[PDB]
Amino acid sequence: MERTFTPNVMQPTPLLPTTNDGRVTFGEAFNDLKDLARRYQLYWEGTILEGNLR
Amino acid sequence: MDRPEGSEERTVQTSNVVLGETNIESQDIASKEYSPTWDRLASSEVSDEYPMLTDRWLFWKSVKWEVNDSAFGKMLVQEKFPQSWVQMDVNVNNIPRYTNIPNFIPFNIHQYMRADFEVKIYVNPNDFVSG
Numbered sequence: 001m002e003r004t005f006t007p008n009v010m011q012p013t014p015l016l017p018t019t020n021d022g023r024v025t026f027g028e029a030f031n032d033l034k035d036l037a038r039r040y041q042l043y044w045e046g047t048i049l050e051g052n053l054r
Numbered sequence: 055m056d057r058p059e060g061s062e063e064r065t066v067q068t069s070n071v072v073l074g075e076t077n078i079e080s081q082d083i084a085s086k087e088y089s090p091t092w093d094r095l096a097s098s099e100v101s102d103e104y105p106m107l108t109d110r111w112l113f114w115k116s117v118k119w120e121v122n123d124s125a126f127g128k129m130l131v132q133e134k135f136p137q138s139w140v141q142m143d144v145n146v147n148n149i150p151r152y153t154n155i156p157n158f159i160p161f162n163i164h165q166y167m168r169a170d171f172e173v174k175i176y177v178n179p180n181d182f183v184s185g
Binding site for chain 1: 092095097098099100
């Protein structure tokens, strides 16, 4: 499958040992964008005066 | 002194270097000794080791302290460690080089390094001084 296609690999060293997505060094894992999307962010913010209303 | 030879001198060997001592030492350890585990998480390239080169007891500085410059708190040595030791071979312009000392020869071709260290301090006074 082309998007992940990696032909004729040339790798000088072995892979880097894992930390389980940060769980070894910090106390938590970071492997899914869905988790970050569950941390609140600003959607909209504004000031309203009497003059903006009916 | 009670023998034809003076007396027995204790010996300590490492690589191809042999150190002799004659008295009971004063010892200490900077921190708890351990075997590293998180260094493997820092570099995917295999860590080379050169024990016959690095495990070698090497001679550092000699520093001369006299009666007339010996006051309480006088600093005979104040050096960044191990920087000052590994970089003790300088040129005409006081620029260090890792190319001549076999113990330091791995430092020239590697970017990152780690080790535990041991430091011995030798003073050979006569029988009639105090300090």
